[PDB]
């Protein structure tokens, strides 16, 4: 149960903050879990999604064992687009269907210097937390 008096548990306040968070909070919010192999390798559970990571779709009409590369991340709509998930409209042109990152798992990451810095920081903090828990 929350005991900090300076953080709110009000439903309307939380929803307002969620729906008007700025883009650099949207990046934090739209994070998705790593695969089992990546989790065991990096000792990290979740990672904010980037432009060209690939994904397994876990829930929804498009769940399956297809590795799909993300094409772009629409933070305004809280959505990512995957190069394989898509549907054709009336005229026949094909448009991407939005998938929320929370229903998404990374197969392997795009290892940029900032990405590996973030991974090492997360792993170090988790390991020191576990060592304190010892």
Beta strands 94-96 and 86-88, pairing class: antiparallel
- Which is nearest to 76 in space by CA: 115, 20, 36? 20
* Cα–Cα distance measured from residue 64 to residue 32, given in angstroms and rounded to the nearest whole number: 17
Please report whether residue 116 would count as binding RNA according to CB under 7 A.
Answer: no
What x/- string results for residues 84 through 103 when contact with RNA is judged by CB under 7 A? Answer: ---x-xxxx--x-xx-x-xx
Residue 134 contact among another protein, RNA, none, beta carbon within 5 to 8 Å by kind: none
Please report whether residue 134 would count as binding RNA according to CB under 7 A.
Answer: no
Residues in contact with RNA, total (CB under 7 A)? Answer: 77
Q: Smallest distance, Å, CB 107 to RNA?
A: 14
Say whether 94 sits in a helix, a strand or coil: strand
Report yes or no: 48 and 34 within 8 Å, Cβ to Cβ.
no
Q: Smallest distance, Å, CB 7 to another protein?
A: 14
Tokens of 58: 């876990």
Which residues in this chain contact another protein in the complex, by CB under 8 A? 1, 9-12
């Amino acid at each position: 149960m929350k005991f900090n008096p300076f953080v709110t548990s009000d439903r309307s306040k939380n929803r307002k903050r969620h729906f008007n968070a700025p883009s650099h909070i949207r990046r934090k919010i739209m994070s998705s879990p790593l695969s089992k192999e990546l989790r065991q390798k990096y000792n990290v559970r979740s990672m904010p999604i980037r432009k060209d990571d690939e994904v397994q779709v876990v829930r929804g009409h498009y769940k399956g064992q297809q590795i799909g590369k993300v094409v772009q991340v629409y933070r305004k709509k809280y959505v990512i687009y995957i190069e394989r998930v898509q549907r054709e409209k009336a005229n026949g042109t094909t448009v991407h269907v939005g998938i929320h990152p929370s229903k998404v798992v990374i197969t392997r990451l795009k290892l940029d210097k900032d990405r590996k810095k973030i991974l090492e920081r997360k792993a170090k903090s988790r390991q020191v937390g576990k060592e304190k828990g010892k």
